[PDB]
Design an enzyme around this catalytic site. Structure first.
Site, PDB file in Angstrom:
ATOM      1  CB  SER A 235      -1.032   0.014   1.128  1.00 29.40           C
ATOM      2  OG  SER A 235      -1.991  -1.026   0.982  1.00 29.40           O
TER       3      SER A 235
ATOM      4  CE  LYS B  84      -4.600   1.624  -1.169  1.00 26.25           C
ATOM      5  NZ  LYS B  84      -4.388   0.417  -0.381  1.00 26.25           N
TER       6      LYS B  84
ATOM      7  CB  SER C  29      -4.859   1.167   3.574  1.00 26.04           C
ATOM      8  OG  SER C  29      -3.889   0.903   2.586  1.00 26.04           O
TER       9      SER C  29
ATOM     10  CE  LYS D  16      -2.043   4.017   2.759  1.00 27.89           C
ATOM     11  NZ  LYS D  16      -1.885   2.656   3.357  1.00 27.89           N
TER      12      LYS D  16
HETATM   13  C1  REZ Z   1      -4.724  -3.218   2.697  1.00 24.34           C
HETATM   14  C2  REZ Z   1      -5.741  -4.328   2.440  1.00 24.34           C
HETATM   15  N1  REZ Z   1      -5.115  -5.651   2.407  1.00 24.34           N
HETATM   16  C3  REZ Z   1      -4.100  -6.068   1.640  1.00 24.34           C
HETATM   17  O1  REZ Z   1      -3.496  -5.376   0.825  1.00 24.34           O
HETATM   18  C4  REZ Z   1      -3.727  -7.516   1.895  1.00 24.34           C
HETATM   19  C5  REZ Z   1      -3.133  -8.224   0.685  1.00 24.34           C
HETATM   20  C6  REZ Z   1      -3.100  -9.726   0.928  1.00 24.34           C
HETATM   21  C7  REZ Z   1      -2.671 -10.462  -0.337  1.00 24.34           C
HETATM   22  C8  REZ Z   1      -2.422 -11.950  -0.087  1.00 24.34           C
HETATM   23  N2  REZ Z   1      -2.493 -12.649  -1.361  1.00 24.34           N
HETATM   24  C9  REZ Z   1      -1.069 -12.171   0.523  1.00 24.34           C
HETATM   25  O2  REZ Z   1      -0.086 -12.280  -0.241  1.00 24.34           O
HETATM   26  O3  REZ Z   1      -0.976 -12.235   1.766  1.00 24.34           O
HETATM   27  C10 REZ Z   1      -6.812  -4.289   3.506  1.00 24.34           C
HETATM   28  O4  REZ Z   1      -6.612  -4.912   4.578  1.00 24.34           O
HETATM   29  O5  REZ Z   1      -7.869  -3.647   3.288  1.00 24.34           O
END
Ligand code: REZ
Ligand code: MG
Ligand code: MG
Length: 466
Positions: free
Chosen positions: A49, A52, A298, A410
């Site tokens: 993130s 972003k 996020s 961030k």
């Molecule tokens: C920020 C957002 N979550 C993510 O970006 C979590 C990404 C997880 C991807 C998963 N395939 C891994 O590799 O663990 C959230 O919690 O809303």
């Protein structure tokens, strides 16, 4: 005094939590330009993130902080003496904050304008963006979760945090032996239900799983919920966010004395329409105020929707191809060296993205002196602040430390990847930093991240509150 700061960040970076990991760590003073620390600063790593940051600066350069988003209801002509129309169109234009209430108030305007029978079908129009819902290299097994919601121009946002393209599922226990009660939320009558869950004895084990199997529009629930358990909620995504927005809009029309006699589906305004009558409309808040729920918590949906909105402003195309070039150009026009950047999406969910720690700091310096600098830094999470809308993803980190209420940064964590980048404002000079960790094989190294930001805050002339 600068020699001792380096010895402590060197010692912090020794931790066993960073076993087999590559870490880019760069610290710079904003008033002079003095590089106070640099480790692997030009190395290319995945950002999660922290991607972003780049997106959000480009959305402010291209769209401006004054920008808002519109939504409309359209018919071929006005309604008659009998108050009849044929087909109706609900048309979305990239609003990342459209609530169910917002739909209800447009359905009152439609009835106020003289409609009492929709004679034909109701259509949902999301043709302001392309119909590519997910990015190429995103993982199919993540698709049930709110951060992997499908991308559309017509999307309904849940709650005060504005999570798009999802529905809230609720599971309540009954008597031991009886099936559990599942509520589908907004997606009731849209998504399909597959309830296989049972109620277990009081004090038994919670084994409840909630799924959306890949390539279906079904919530599948399995397991036991103990009779004495607090009821469970879970956000789950749906197929075609716009068709749900459609379904949710005829319910609103019906609740408001307007009768829909036909079906509901996807489709755009026929184009052989020469003068469409607009019967209702809504306008979002401005991008500056939208940046807050977006950056504090996020939001992945917001970032992907803002990219496609950059494609429209620069090229007339609501596409990842076009928006990603728009991000790249806007970053250059601000003064950022984008040699080490690889841009595959706006949210940072893609493992096709690459940044460098020298690049992030370059951005943080340029964004510091841009006309929109205050609206930018306000959206970033502040360390140790209780309030969700002030602390965001740093609400429960660095409390009781010299960094509480000071460090603005961030976050971004995934399997194998974690990052913290932002500002340490203080009387001993305003600092800019980027920490990017790749290759670690346990828990994300959050305490190593915290440890550095805290030490930099003491260097900037702050003390732990008591
Ligand atoms: C920020 C957002 N979550 C993510 O970006 C979590 C990404 C997880 C991807 C998963 N395939 C891994 O590799 O663990 C959230 O919690 O809303
Ligand atoms: Mg319904
Ligand atoms: Mg302070």
């Amino acid at each position: 005094r600068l020699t001792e700061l380096r010895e402590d960040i060197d010692a912090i970076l020794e931790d066993p939590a960073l076993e087999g990991a590559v870490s880019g760590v760069v610290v710079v003073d904003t008033a002079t330009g003095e590089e106070l620390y640099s480790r692997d600063g030009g190395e290319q790593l995945l950002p999660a993130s922290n991607m972003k940051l780049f997106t959000a600066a480009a959305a402010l350069e291209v769209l401006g902080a004054d920008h808002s988003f519109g939504t409309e209801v359209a018919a071929e002509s006005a309604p008659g003496r009998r108050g009849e129309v044929q087909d109706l169109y609900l048309v979305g234009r990239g609003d990342p904050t459209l609530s169910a209430e917002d739909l209800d108030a447009m359905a009152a305007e439609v009835a106020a304008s003289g409609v009492r029978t929709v004679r034909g079908d109701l259509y949902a129009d999301d043709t302001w963006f392309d119909s590519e819902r997910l990015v190429d290299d995103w993982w199919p097994e993540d698709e049930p979760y709110a951060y992997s919601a499908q991308i559309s121009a017509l999307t309904v946002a849940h709650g005060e945090r504005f999570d798009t393209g999802v529905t809230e599922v609720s599971v309540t226990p009954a008597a031991e032996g009886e099936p559990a009660d599942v509520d589908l939320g907004a997606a009731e009558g849209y998504a399909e239900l597959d309830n296989r869950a049972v109620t277990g004895a009081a004090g038994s084990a919670n084994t409840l799983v909630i799924d959306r199997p890949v390539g279906t529009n079904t919530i599948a629930v399995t397991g036991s919920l103990p009779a004495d358990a607090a009821p469970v909620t879970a956000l789950r995504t749906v197929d075609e966010p716009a068709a749900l927005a459609g379904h949710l809009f005829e319910e609103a029309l019906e609740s408001n004395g307007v009768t829909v006699k036909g079906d509901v589906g996807l489709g755009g305004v026929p184009a052989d329409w020469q003068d469409a009558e607009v019967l209702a409309d809504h306008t979002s808040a401005e991008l500056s105020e939208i940046l807050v729920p977006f950056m504090k918590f996020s939001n992945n949906g917001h970032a992907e929707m803002l990219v496609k909105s950059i494609g429209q402003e620069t090229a007339g195309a609501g596409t990842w191809d076009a928006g990603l070039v728009g991000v790249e150009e806007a970053l250059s026009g601000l003064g950022v060296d984008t040699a080490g950047l690889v841009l595959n999406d706006g949210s940072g969910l893609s493992r096709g993205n690459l940044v460098t720690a020298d690049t992030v700091v370059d951005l943080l310096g340029q964004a510091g002196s841009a006309p929109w600098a205050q609206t930018w830094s306000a959206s970033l999470p502040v360390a140790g602040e209780s309030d969700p809308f002030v602390g965001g993803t740093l609400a429960n980190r660095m409390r009781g430390t010299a960094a509480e209420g000071v460090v603005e940064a961030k976050t971004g964590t995934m399997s194998g990847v974690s990052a913290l980048s932002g500002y340490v404002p203080g009387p001993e000079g305003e600092l800019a930093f980027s920490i990017v960790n790749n290759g670690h094989s346990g828990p994300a190294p959050l305490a190593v991240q915290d440890a550095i930001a805290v030490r930099l805050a003491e260097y900037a002339g702050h003390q732990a509150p008591e």
